[PDB]
Design an enzyme around this catalytic site. Structure first.
Site, PDB file in Angstrom:
ATOM      1  N   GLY A  15       0.838  -1.200   0.000  1.00  0.00           N
ATOM      2  CA  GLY A  15       0.000   0.000   0.000  1.00  0.00           C
ATOM      3  C   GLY A  15       0.856   1.227   0.000  1.00  0.00           C
ATOM      4  N   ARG A  18      -0.905   9.105   0.276  1.00  0.00           N
ATOM      5  CA  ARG A  18      -0.493  10.347   0.975  1.00  0.00           C
ATOM      6  C   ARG A  18      -0.129  10.016   2.445  1.00  0.00           C
ATOM      7  N   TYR A  19      -0.766   9.032   3.098  1.00  0.00           N
ATOM      8  CA  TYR A  19      -0.482   8.658   4.521  1.00  0.00           C
ATOM      9  C   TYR A  19       0.992   8.242   4.664  1.00  0.00           C
ATOM     10  CZ  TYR A  19      -1.201   3.843   2.756  1.00  0.00           C
ATOM     11  OH  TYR A  19      -1.221   2.729   1.986  1.00  0.00           O
ATOM     12  N   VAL A  22       2.506   1.020   3.417  1.00  0.00           N
ATOM     13  CA  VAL A  22       2.515  -0.203   4.267  1.00  0.00           C
ATOM     14  C   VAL A  22       3.299  -1.295   3.552  1.00  0.00           C
ATOM     15  CG1 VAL A  22       1.174  -1.946   5.538  1.00  0.00           C
ATOM     16  CG2 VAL A  22       0.349   0.418   5.355  1.00  0.00           C
ATOM     17  N   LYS A  35       3.753   0.119   8.809  1.00  0.00           N
ATOM     18  CA  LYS A  35       3.272   1.385   8.249  1.00  0.00           C
ATOM     19  C   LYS A  35       4.352   2.418   8.481  1.00  0.00           C
ATOM     20  CE  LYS A  35      -0.495   4.734   8.105  1.00  0.00           C
ATOM     21  NZ  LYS A  35      -1.879   5.004   8.544  1.00  0.00           N
ATOM     22  N   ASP A 134     -12.783   7.037  11.385  1.00  0.00           N
ATOM     23  CA  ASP A 134     -12.508   6.852   9.945  1.00  0.00           C
ATOM     24  C   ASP A 134     -12.850   5.404   9.557  1.00  0.00           C
ATOM     25  OD1 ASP A 134     -11.887   7.568   7.334  1.00  0.00           O
ATOM     26  OD2 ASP A 134      -9.719   7.402   7.673  1.00  0.00           O
TER      27      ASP A 134
END
Ligand SMILES: COc1cc(-c2cncc(-c3ccc(C4CCN(C)CC4)cc3)c2C)cc(OC)c1OC
Ligand SMILES: COc1cc(-c2cncc(-c3ccc(C4CCN(C)CC4)cc3)c2C)cc(OC)c1OC
Ligand SMILES: COc1cc(-c2cncc(-c3ccc(C4CCN(C)CC4)cc3)c2C)cc(OC)c1OC
Length: 285
Positions: A15, A18-19, A22, A35, A134
């Site tokens: 993955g 923007r975060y 992972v 992460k 979320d």
């Protein structure tokens, strides 16, 4: 006196956003998920770390915490969150290809309700009450045993970045949410749970029929919908996701349609609680 083996081998990126990213990683021959946070989303690492330093959550339907790591670099701070690794990936990912039968659909949604009720409940002795803020299908992982677990407590709030706009409740979109009342945050999670329940139910086969995977509101908002796009649909026009006719021939989907309706009341205090959702799901089939 003792070796502390800290090396984690990053093996495959699963993955990127923007975060941050992972990774599937390896520690002492076992898979872990790593992460790696962007500079932009450091506060998500701090919040999840502060929560786990307050209460070490342990629940089969909560992504399992292993570690929070801060490492000093030449010109930057590196922030990692290390968790259990779920090789089947997210519920969002899983529903794209896979269809469900009655038992697998119920098992998925009751496991999510179970994780969510665990977050929400204050236990004395124990844990503070926690709202997720979320909840969505990308923040739920599928386990090999057919249950799911809830991930990403970077926005979570404890009692005793903003949410994904597609899944925001009407009182978040119209800024009427009672921000001083912790129950307000539980009711925002219930709204989002109802949308997830709709996403999953669509993929349950009945009478040889299934709907294609779609995200909530796919038919009324664009990709990356704005706040205004969402407010007009959810607040002004008061639209809700479609229940297909074919569900009303199937007793499980008929019961799930009723449940998801009772997560989507405009009035937040009319919505079901996670505990009531669990009870209803145990009485289906
Ligand atoms: C610092 O950093 C990381 C450390 C580790 C890690 C590796 N070996 C052993 C340990 C360990 C655990 C617990 C004790 C206890 C034993 C009982 N005694 C009464 C109190 C202390 C000692 C040692 C750890 C914590 C893994 C990591 O990543 C997976 C680390 O990086 C995040
Ligand atoms: C962070 O994560 C992992 C950590 C470890 C691990 C490595 N060394 C030592 C330990 C340990 C030993 C003993 C105590 C206690 C026992 C009772 N009393 C005396 C208090 C002290 C605590 C901790 C652990 C838990 C293994 C893991 O997996 C096999 C971990 O998971 C990836
Ligand atoms: C939602 O958020 C977080 C998720 C995770 C996480 C934990 N286990 C497994 C995963 C994963 C593994 C594999 C795939 C793919 C790759 C292979 N195949 C072809 C399709 C499946 C996707 C996803 C993730 C992403 C960890 C997190 O933190 C460390 C998260 O953040 C809180």
């Amino acid at each position: 006196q003792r070796t502390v083996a800290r090396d984690i081998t990053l093996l495959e990126c699963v993955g990127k956003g923007r975060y941050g990213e992972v990774w599937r990683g390896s520690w002492q021959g076992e898979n872990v998920a790593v992460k790696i946070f962007s500079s932009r989303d450091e506060k998500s690492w701090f919040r999840e770390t502060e929560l786990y330093n307050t209460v070490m959550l342990r629940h089969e339907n909560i992504l399992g915490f292993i570690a929070s790591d801060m490492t000093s670099r030449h010109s930057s701070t590196q922030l990692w969150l290390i968790t259990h690794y779920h090789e089947m990936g997210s519920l969002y990912d899983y529903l794209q290809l896979t269809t469900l039968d009655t038992v697998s659909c119920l098992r998925i949604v009751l496991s999510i309700a179970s994780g969510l009720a665990h977050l929400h409940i204050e236990i004395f002795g124990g844990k503070p009450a926690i709202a997720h803020r979320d909840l969505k299908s990308k923040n739920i992982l599928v386990k090999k045993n057919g249950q799911c677990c809830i991930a990403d407590l970077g926005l979570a709030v404890m009692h005793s970045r903003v949410g994904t706009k597609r899944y925001m409740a009407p009182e978040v979109l119209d800024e009427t949410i009672q921000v001083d009342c912790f129950d307000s945050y539980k009711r925002v999670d219930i709204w989002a749970f109802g949308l997830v329940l709709w996403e999953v139910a669509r993929r349950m086969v009945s009478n040889g029929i299934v709907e294609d995977y779609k995200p909530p509101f796919y038919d009324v908002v664009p990709n990356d919908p704005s706040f205004e796009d969402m407010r007009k649909v959810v607040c002004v026009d008061q639209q809700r996701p479609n229940i297909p006719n074919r569900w009303f021939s199937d007793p499980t989907l008929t019961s799930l349609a009723k449940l998801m309706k009772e997560c989507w009341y405009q009035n937040p205090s009319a919505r079901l609680t996670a505990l009531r959702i669990k009870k209803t799901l145990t009485k289906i089939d």
